[PDB]
Amino acid sequence: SGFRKMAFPSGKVEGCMVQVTCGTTTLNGLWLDDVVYCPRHVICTSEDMLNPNYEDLLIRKSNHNFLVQAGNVQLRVIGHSMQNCVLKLKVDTANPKTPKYKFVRIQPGQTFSVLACYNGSPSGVYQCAMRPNFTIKGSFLNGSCGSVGFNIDYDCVSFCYMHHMELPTGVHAGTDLEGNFYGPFVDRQTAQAAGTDTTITVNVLAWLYAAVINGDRWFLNRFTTTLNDFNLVAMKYNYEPLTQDHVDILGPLSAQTGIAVLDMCASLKELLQNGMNGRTILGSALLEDEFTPFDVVRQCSGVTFQ
Amino acid sequence: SGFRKMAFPSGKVEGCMVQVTCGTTTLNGLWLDDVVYCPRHVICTSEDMLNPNYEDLLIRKSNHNFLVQAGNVQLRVIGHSMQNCVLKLKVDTANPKTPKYKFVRIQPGQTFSVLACYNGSPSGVYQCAMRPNFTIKGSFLNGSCGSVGFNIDYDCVSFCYMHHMELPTGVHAGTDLEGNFYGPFVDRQTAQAAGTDTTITVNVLAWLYAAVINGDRWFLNRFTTTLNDFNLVAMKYNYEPLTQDHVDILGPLSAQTGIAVLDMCASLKELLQNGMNGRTILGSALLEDEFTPFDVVRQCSGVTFQ
Ligand SMILES: *C(=N)[C@H](C[C@@H]1CCNC1=O)NC(=O)[C@@H]1[C@@H]2[C@H](CN1C(=O)[C@@H](NC(=O)C(F)(F)F)C(C)(C)C)C2(C)C
Ligand SMILES: *C(=N)[C@H](C[C@@H]1CCNC1=O)NC(=O)[C@@H]1[C@@H]2[C@H](CN1C(=O)[C@@H](NC(=O)C(F)(F)F)C(C)(C)C)C2(C)C
């Protein structure tokens, strides 16, 4: 019993974190094989960040202008390249601690762990979801850029995010490990709108199934609904539309509890239309949308990694 | 900006996890130097756990009856000892991955990270607090016993908890690394009461200061209070009494925000007496008590570890 926001063990990623300095700007880098990946704004001064021309700024930088430090030991930079919004520094030493890894571009609604770092050193780990508006609700201060988001499948680390900036609503923006931003964000210090933040409906339903498995089922009502009638209600509350693909993904949890997805949709509708009346679900007074159906199955089954 | 429940990076602890089997029971062990620490109920069958006499049960066990596995390699057990509710297995190999460590017995209200494990392998990491009633609100399934709680001060791991059992209210119980239970719990499968769960007042105040630092300050009112008048209200809501020691611990946060602790107490009083009226604080619809004043300072300052 019990249900908590759980991050993946971070040991494999800790061994990949390095500190990257260019001039007076220092941030975090990810050292995998003989390449160090970092946000390209490491080459910017505070002034440059207002309206940077990254191509012109980078042209005045040579290999020796990038200091890469792993603990107390300096890595020698033998090449550099800009790939979208990430800078790749080729070093003369392959990271001996490189785990089995892949680079992935996740979809909105999917979750991942973040190892927040400062000056190349680990500070902490937490679980995030890519919001439907391509922002994340993290905790990042100045110097946290370069910190990465990842998932782990047994012994393989799938890197999916690199932190770049904070938007005016307090939420965060970043890229995949090919340097392409999630969302319409740009790496420039200018006013940027995130857009309406919608609730990840399939995740809320997954979390309601987690509540049932844990014995918390006061919210289960005597009604059922249809996909179209549920979506008419969901769209009023800025909930993402539910599709037959989401219904299928919920299949294991539906079969475990004996509760049809459309019956759970009717209980969700009543929670949206009536609130929780001072009550809680899994110790929460709000409907939680940062647990995917996979996260629920994993935590309820005790899936382990190498 | 942003405020999340953050766990310590788990790499140093991952390198210490082993699998311990005795007969048909398998659980997690912690391998530090040439000793493996694990819950003594590893020697029990399902039947034994109803009313065990650990001393008689252990007397029928020899070194060769304990299989200790680190990954795929078997460790040789050359000695065994029962210390309160933990079993210590002396092995012939010192763990090469042993970090700098200490064993500590934490106080109620203090927080720590848990690396939940199954069969000696890491599953995930989350942050917990030792409740005033000496229970934790974790997420543990059968086989998670032996998983540990720890804090990290730069490069030193302070182990403070080892998981043993789940109480009927869904909360968990365990020991320090000397095998002494936190609370009045015993390692026997019998009805056990946790006692009233009170709110960690100094932690709620710390989290209110975190909200202010992050720009979330709708709740700040025009009132102040006294320690005795606040405590008369707090005790009605099952809040722990606030002392001058707690006021002093809040000092850095009080000085950073310019908000006196007694002024913050008056705003807390109004939140307890009026609720939050459908509003949230740091994305939460309840008053959060699992962030100590130290956790707030650390997350707001970006403290890092080796
Ligand atoms: C990199 N270490 C920081 C991390 C920021 C600092 C506060 N919390 C974070 O996540 N990244 C930046 O400073 C980036 C950087 C220039 C400006 N910047 C911002 O995050 C700014 N944001 C924006 O201008 C906005 F709103 F468009 F997102 C800031 C105002 C400082 C929060 C570049 C190159 C994008
Ligand atoms: C060890 N792997 C498990 C972990 C439990 C299983 C469910 N979630 C957990 O945290 N520990 C146990 O099975 C311990 C073990 C015997 C009984 N037990 C319990 O946790 C039981 N609890 C109690 O009897 C109670 F209420 F007193 F706490 C159980 C009913 C199985 C939840 C021993 C030796 C204490």
Coordinates of N, CA, C and O and ligand atoms in Angstrom, one line a residue, chain A residues 41 49 54 140-145 163-168 172 186-192, chain B residues 1, ligand 1:
Chain A
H41 N 23.3 28.5 -24.9 CA 23.5 29.8 -24.3 C 24.6 29.8 -23.3 O 24.9 30.9 -22.8
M49 N 22.0 37.4 -24.2 CA 20.8 36.7 -24.0 C 19.5 37.5 -24.4 O 18.5 36.9 -24.7
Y54 N 23.2 33.3 -32.3 CA 24.1 32.3 -31.8 C 25.2 31.9 -32.8 O 26.3 31.6 -32.4
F140 N 13.9 25.1 -10.6 CA 15.2 25.4 -11.2 C 15.5 26.8 -10.8 O 14.7 27.7 -11.0
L141 N 16.8 27.0 -10.5 CA 17.4 28.3 -10.2 C 18.4 28.6 -11.3 O 18.7 27.8 -12.1
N142 N 19.0 29.8 -11.3 CA 20.1 30.2 -12.2 C 21.2 29.3 -12.1 O 21.7 28.9 -11.0
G143 N 21.7 28.8 -13.2 CA 22.8 27.8 -13.2 C 22.4 26.4 -13.4 O 23.2 25.5 -13.6
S144 N 21.0 26.1 -13.3 CA 20.5 24.7 -13.4 C 20.4 24.3 -14.9 O 20.2 23.1 -15.1
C145 N 20.6 25.2 -15.9 CA 20.5 24.8 -17.3 C 21.6 23.7 -17.6 O 22.6 23.7 -17.0
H163 N 17.3 21.0 -19.6 CA 16.8 22.3 -19.2 C 17.4 23.5 -19.8 O 18.7 23.6 -19.7
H164 N 16.6 24.5 -20.3 CA 17.1 25.7 -20.8 C 16.6 27.0 -20.1 O 17.4 27.9 -19.9
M165 N 15.3 27.1 -19.8 CA 14.8 28.4 -19.3 C 13.5 28.4 -18.5 O 12.8 27.4 -18.5
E166 N 13.2 29.5 -17.8 CA 11.9 29.6 -17.1 C 11.0 30.6 -17.7 O 11.4 31.7 -18.0
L167 N 9.7 30.2 -17.9 CA 8.7 31.1 -18.5 C 8.1 32.0 -17.4 O 8.2 31.7 -16.2
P168 N 7.4 33.1 -17.8 CA 6.8 34.1 -16.7 C 5.8 33.5 -15.8 O 5.6 34.0 -14.7
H172 N 8.7 25.8 -16.8 CA 10.0 25.7 -17.4 C 9.9 25.1 -18.8 O 9.0 24.4 -19.2
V186 N 11.8 29.7 -27.7 CA 13.1 30.1 -28.2 C 14.1 30.4 -27.1 O 13.7 30.8 -26.0
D187 N 15.4 30.2 -27.3 CA 16.4 30.5 -26.3 C 16.8 31.9 -26.4 O 18.0 32.2 -26.6
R188 N 15.9 32.8 -26.1 CA 16.1 34.3 -26.0 C 15.3 34.8 -24.8 O 14.2 34.4 -24.6
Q189 N 15.9 35.8 -24.1 CA 15.3 36.5 -23.0 C 14.3 37.6 -23.5 O 14.6 38.8 -23.6
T190 N 13.1 37.1 -23.9 CA 12.1 37.9 -24.4 C 10.8 37.3 -23.9 O 10.7 36.1 -23.7
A191 N 9.7 38.1 -23.7 CA 8.4 37.7 -23.3 C 7.9 36.5 -24.2 O 7.9 36.6 -25.4
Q192 N 7.5 35.4 -23.5 CA 7.1 34.2 -24.3 C 5.9 33.6 -23.6 O 5.9 33.4 -22.4
Chain B
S1 N 12.6 29.8 -9.8 CA 11.2 29.6 -9.3 C 10.8 28.1 -9.4 O 11.5 27.3 -10.1
Ligands
LIG1 C1 19.8 28.8 -16.9 N1 20.6 28.4 -16.0 C2 18.7 29.7 -16.6 C3 17.7 28.9 -15.7 C4 16.5 29.9 -15.3 C5 16.9 30.9 -14.3 C6 15.7 31.0 -13.4 N2 15.1 29.7 -13.4 C7 15.5 29.0 -14.6 O1 15.0 27.9 -15.0 N3 18.1 30.1 -17.9 C8 18.0 31.4 -18.3 O2 18.4 32.3 -17.6 C9 17.3 31.6 -19.6 C10 18.3 31.9 -20.6 C11 18.1 33.3 -21.1 C12 16.9 33.9 -20.3 N4 16.5 32.8 -19.5 C13 15.3 32.7 -18.7 O3 15.0 31.7 -18.2 C14 14.5 33.9 -18.6 N5 13.2 33.5 -19.2 C15 12.7 34.2 -20.3 O4 13.1 35.3 -20.8 C16 11.4 33.6 -20.8 F1 10.3 34.1 -20.1 F2 11.2 33.9 -22.1 F3 11.3 32.3 -20.7 C17 14.4 34.4 -17.2 C18 13.6 35.7 -17.3 C19 15.8 34.7 -16.7 C20 13.6 33.5 -16.3 C21 18.0 32.2 -22.1 C22 19.1 32.1 -23.1 C23 16.7 31.8 -22.6

